[PDB]
Amino acid sequence: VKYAFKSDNLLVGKSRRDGVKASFKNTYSTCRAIKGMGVKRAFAYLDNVLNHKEIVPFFKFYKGVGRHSQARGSGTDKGRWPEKSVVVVKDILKQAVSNAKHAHKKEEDELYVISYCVNRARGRRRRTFRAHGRISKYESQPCHVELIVGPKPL
Amino acid sequence: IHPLPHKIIIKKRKNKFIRFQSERFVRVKPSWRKPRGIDSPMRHQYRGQRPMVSIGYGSDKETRFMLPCGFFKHRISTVHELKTLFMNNKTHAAQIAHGVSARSRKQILEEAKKMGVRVLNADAKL
Amino acid sequence: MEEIKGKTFLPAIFVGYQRSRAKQRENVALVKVSGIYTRAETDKVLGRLIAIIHSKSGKPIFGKICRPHGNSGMVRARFYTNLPGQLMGHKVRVFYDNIDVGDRATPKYERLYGNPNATVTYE
Amino acid sequence: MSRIVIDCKGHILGRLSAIVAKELLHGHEVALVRCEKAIISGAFRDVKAHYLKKMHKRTNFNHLRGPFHFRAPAEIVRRTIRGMIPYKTVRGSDAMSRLRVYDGIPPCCARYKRVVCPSAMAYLCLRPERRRCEVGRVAHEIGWQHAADVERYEKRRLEECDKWYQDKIQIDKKIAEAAEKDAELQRINAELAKY
RNA sequence: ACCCCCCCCUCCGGCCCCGCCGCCCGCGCCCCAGCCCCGUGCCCCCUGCCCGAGGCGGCCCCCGCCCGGGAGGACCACCC
RNA sequence: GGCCCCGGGGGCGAAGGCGGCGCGCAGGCCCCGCCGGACCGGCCUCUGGUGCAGAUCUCGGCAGCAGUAGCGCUACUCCGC
RNA sequence: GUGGGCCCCUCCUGGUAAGCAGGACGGGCGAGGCGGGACGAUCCGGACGCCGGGCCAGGGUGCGCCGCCGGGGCCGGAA
RNA sequence: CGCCCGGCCGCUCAAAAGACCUGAACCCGGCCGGCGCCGGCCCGCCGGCCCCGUCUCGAAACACGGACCGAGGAGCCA
Ligand SMILES: [K+]
Ligand SMILES: [K+]
Ligand SMILES: [K+]
Ligand SMILES: [K+]
Ligand SMILES: [K+]
Ligand SMILES: [K+]
Ligand SMILES: [K+]
Ligand SMILES: [K+]
Ligand SMILES: [K+]
Ligand SMILES: [K+]
Ligand SMILES: [K+]
Ligand SMILES: [K+]
Ligand SMILES: [K+]
Ligand SMILES: [K+]
Ligand SMILES: [K+]
Ligand SMILES: [K+]
Ligand SMILES: [Mg+2]
Ligand SMILES: [Mg+2]
Ligand SMILES: [Mg+2]
Ligand SMILES: [Mg+2]
Ligand SMILES: [Mg+2]
Ligand SMILES: [Mg+2]
Ligand SMILES: [Mg+2]
Ligand SMILES: [Mg+2]
Ligand SMILES: [Mg+2]
Ligand SMILES: [Mg+2]
Ligand SMILES: [Mg+2]
Ligand SMILES: [Mg+2]
Ligand SMILES: [Mg+2]
Ligand SMILES: [Mg+2]
């Protein structure tokens, strides 16, 4: 699809992935948790989620997400450690930093995460069997993911 | 470029008459309809309901259909129609129909300037 | 207030619109004038220029006193522009001197749609 | 926009409440002092049973949702005034926030200039044979814990104000000596014509 | 007066004092009697309309977790 | 079916779409900006399968619920990437 | 189109009675906006195009809540 | 064509029209602003306002139908 970020007087690095086989709600929260970070920080932070040293806070899709001790100062008490969404976002981040560090020779020490947009895509459609002869749906909820890197926001 | 002096224009209602309950449902459009239900509060006209349309709101017969600039409207599409509707006038200004191209609006506009006619969309397509 | 700055005045209060328990007439304001307790001693403040300060612009709004209300010293007033509800309980000024504000103290229905049988000249 | 400070001693509860509420809606700040000396007409025991029948009304399934019944004399007065206010609107909530009620005369009001409303005072309002009771005594019978503290504080305060009056007396004999400022004798004589 | 209200006892918004260490705002004190009411039946009446010390009363701000044990425990929290 | 004064409007931008003024008591009409990329009408006479909020309406799409409810047959572990 | 009516005031019939059931002149709701009777299809006034000004019916005039003073008295339900 | 290890940049073309004309509603994600209808005032205050359609003497009813949105949908003819 097309890009949702339209700025025209910044030097940016961009990458996207269309139709990602990962939960939409999990992946939205992972991208919103790294917004505004410098790209050194977000790369460490994402490796810590993999190792259960930090959490992803959940501000939008949280009914049934458990409260945990690792989320004390964030604004909420709820979070999780989505391992498959962190695998996707890390690889999309590296393309955008490569795209920027190669089009204009800017270091990772002045790059920041300044935009994101997650959108709902069209899923795989299977079926499950219910009692008394009935059939029901069993679908996936995939996503489109985009991520922009550039200079410190102000 | 100016009309003759007229009476002061009065509009008895300033807003539009909106269909009952069109703010609750997207499927119900704001165009006016007459309430016709047996229990309808809008039809009974209890206090605090929307106003109802009636011929008591009609405009003063001398100023009805008069644009804010003082002129009545004529809608034209060709240069031939420019001359026929404006032989006798000073009560109407003219309007170019939306489908007329940019090539031919130059011919209508310059011609109508000589006749001494106001056009109300003079500067549409540069 | 750079034109009413030095003008001494008698204090008043805007208590509410003219109303019944069913309806409310926002084009007339009810006003309490200090030292006026009787319907009879309302003659002295009758027909005089008053003003209220709208404390969003800081400018005044000008008006005049039209009728008495009740038996107890209340009056009716009409302002240049009808008042907003936020202004209730605020102070009103009754000027002791005269001020020529032209026609900036008169209500909007009387200024336009006042029916002088008059015309639009078109220069 | 000063503050009007009313000494509630001797006043009828409901006839004072009506005045304050009408003043509050005219954008006035009002304080009320000595709320335990206000008066309710009727025999003390009739007044008592009336306030004990209110306290019986509570939400059956959870008393934290219910009507709350306040026991101090200042809060009883404040709840009476709220009955005469549209307090659930913005105009009504702004009026409650302009009101203050006090048991005794505390230091935050001790130098305020006081007034009274004789049209709502019991010696002008009630017939000589009508019974009457003080709000402070009713409160003490329904649960107010501080009846004895207000008296101790009131006592110490009046002695200190009784010493003050003696020096204030002398000050008036110097302040008022000033009939030697002519630029005021020109003010008094012009005020004379109009009075 | 087995009744009723308060104490004891359980919860407890808010607040106060003390540790580490700035702002702002306001300008006004007799008391007590009403069949002694002690000479009354007043004052105020300009919160800006030209007002803007000190004392006396107010207002604001001020304090980390993760991590591991437990007498604590659904998850959290709690006590160390 | 006709008219639209040298023969009605159109790639110098038709129909439709999205916003915004105006006119009419109203049903509705007209104009402008952006999109779109080939057809469309005002007045007179004629014709009809001619106007939707509802019918446990029909067909299609799809929300909250919700990252929720949920995932018999004893059992796997270490090393070889 | 209608041929299920109902209510009020006076006058009646059956029934211990009923917001029960059945009849009568006139009026109303039905199919009648507005104000008042806290609250109500029918009670008290008043029957309706869109506005500006004036006068005021019925009910009322401590505060909620628009509007009051003076004067003379007194201080649900049966045997 | 190039650069990184699918993405970026950009090429064909009047145009991506890129798996396809136009591309509405319901519903949703990112940035920016704010905290139901009628009336008065420039604007968050005050005043008024029960859920429509239906059968019915009588409906806000604890009477029935109706999550939402689009398109179709019922007095014509002999
Ligand atoms: K609508
Ligand atoms: K009906
Ligand atoms: K008890
Ligand atoms: K005990
Ligand atoms: K569910
Ligand atoms: K019987
Ligand atoms: K009738
Ligand atoms: K029905
Ligand atoms: K039926
Ligand atoms: K029936
Ligand atoms: K109904
Ligand atoms: K019911
Ligand atoms: K209901
Ligand atoms: K029914
Ligand atoms: K049923
Ligand atoms: K229903
Ligand atoms: Mg199954
Ligand atoms: Mg089967
Ligand atoms: Mg056909
Ligand atoms: Mg049809
Ligand atoms: Mg439909
Ligand atoms: Mg009956
Ligand atoms: Mg009927
Ligand atoms: Mg009513
Ligand atoms: Mg009043
Ligand atoms: Mg397409
Ligand atoms: Mg039937
Ligand atoms: Mg049925
Ligand atoms: Mg249903
Ligand atoms: Mg349709």
The answer for A133, left when phi > 0, alpha when psi is -120 to 50, beta otherwise, is left
Residue B113: φ, ψ to 5°? -65, -40
Q: How far is the CA of B38 from the centre of ligand 2 (A)?
A: 5
CA–CA distance, C4 with C105 (Å, rounded to integer): 14
Q: Which nucleotides of H are covered by protein (CB under 7 A)?
A: 3-9, 25-31, 36-50, 52-56, 59-60, 68-70
User: Which residues contact residue B48 at a Cβ distance below 8 angstroms, ignoring those fewer than 6 apart?
Assistant: none
Across-strand partners of A129? A135
Nucleotide nearest to C7 (CA to C1'): E49
Residues 6+ positions from D154 with CB-CB distance below 8 Å: D104, D105
Q: In this structure, what token pair is assigned to residue D160?
A: 């200190």
CA D16 – CA D31 distance, rounded (Å): 12
In angstroms, how far is CA B21 from the centroid of its own chain?
26
Resolution in Å, one decimal place: 2.8
Q: Protein D95 CA to nucleic acid H27 C1', in Å?
A: 45
Torsion sign, CA atoms D115, D118, D120, D122: positive
Residues of C in contact with D94 (CB under 8 A): 89
The neighbour count for residue D162, using CB atoms within 10 Å, is: 9
d(CA D48, CA B6): 78
Rounded (10°) angle between helices D135-142 and D73-82: 110
The three state secondary structure string of chain A is CCCCCCCCCCCCEEEEEEEECCCHHHHHHHHHCCCCCEHHHHHHHHHHHHCCCCCEECCCCCCCCCECHHHCCCCCCEEECCHHHHHHHHHHHHHHHHHHHHHCCCCHHHCEEEEEEEEECCCCEEEEEECCCEEEEEECCCEEEEEEEECCCC
Total residue length of chain A = 154
In the numeric block, which tokens belong to residue A124?
Answer: 């795989």
Tokens of B72: 């009545």
D165 CB-contact burial (10 Å; exposed 0-12 / middle 13-18 / buried 19+):
exposed
Contact at CB, D25 and C15, closer than 8 angstroms: yes
Instruction: Give me C14's structure tokens.
Output: 């805007």
Handedness of CA D109, D115, D120, D126 (dihedral sign): positive
User: For chain D, where are the alpha helices, taking DSSP H only?
Assistant: 13-24, 44-54, 73-82, 90-96, 122-125, 135-142, 147-175, 182-194
DSSP helix/strand/coil, D80: helix
Answer whether D26 sits within 8 Å of C89, measured CB to CB. yes
CA distances from C10 to A7, A115, B24, C51 (A): 60, 61, 51, 11
**Cβ contact A142:A121 at 8 Å:** yes
Rounded CA-CA distance C95/C10 in Å is 6
Smallest CA–CA distance from C109 into chain B, residue: B10
| Three-class SS state of D104 | coil
Q: How far is the CA of B36 from the C1' of G3 (A)?
A: 26
CA of A153 to the centre of ligand 25 (A): 59
How far CA D2 is from CA of C33, D85, D113, in Å, comes to 18, 22, 11
- CB atoms D27 and C90 under 8 Å: yes
CA of A91 to the centre of ligand 6 (A): 93
Q: Could you tell me if C20 lies within 8 Å of chain B, comparing CB atoms?
A: no
A38 CB neighbour count, 10 Å cutoff: 15
Q: Are D24 and D30 in contact (CB under 8 A)?
A: yes
Residues on chain C touching B4 (C-beta within 8 angstroms): 122
Residue type, D5: V
| Among chain B residues 89-118, those with CB within 7 Å of any atom of strand F | 95-104
| DSSP SS3 for D147 | helix
Cα(B37) to centroid(ligand 22), Å: 28
Q: What are phi and psi of D12, to 5 degrees?
A: -80, 135
Is B2 in Cβ contact with C122 (below 8 Å)? yes
> What is the distance in angstroms measured between the alpha-carbon CA of D171 and the sugar C1' of E38?
25
Nearest nucleotide to the CA of A77, by C1', is E76
Q: Do B5 and C123 touch (CB under 8 A)?
A: no
Distances (CA, A) of D13 to D62, D80, D142: 31, 8, 18
Query: What's the CA gap between A3 and A119, in Å, rounded?
Result: 11
Distances (CA, A) of C52 to C60, C95, C111, D27, D54: 6, 11, 20, 15, 45
d(CA B121, CA B109): 10
Q: How far apart are CA C60 and CA C55, in angstroms?
A: 9
| Contact C97/B at CB under 8 A | no
Say whether residue D91 is in contact with chain C using an 8 A CB cutoff. yes
In chain C, which residue's Cα lies nearest the Cα of D23? C89
Among partner residues B2, B6, B10, which is closest to C119 by beta-carbon distance? B6
In sequence order, the 6+-apart residues with CB closer than 8 A to the CB of C40 are none
Chain D meets chain C (3+ C-beta pairs below 8 A): yes
State which residues have CB under 5 angstroms from ligand 17, the bound ion: A 129
- Residues of B with Cβ-Cβ distance to C121 under 8 angstroms: 5
List the structure tokens of D136.
């402070």
Distance CA C17, CA A111 (A): 61
How far apart, in whole angstroms, are the C-alpha atoms of residue C79 and residue C49? Answer: 10
Q: Return the C-alpha torsion angle A132, A136, A138, A144, nearest 10.
A: -170
Method: cryo-EM
- Give the H or E element holding residue B43: helix B41-44
Phi and psi, residue A48, nearest 5° = -75, -35
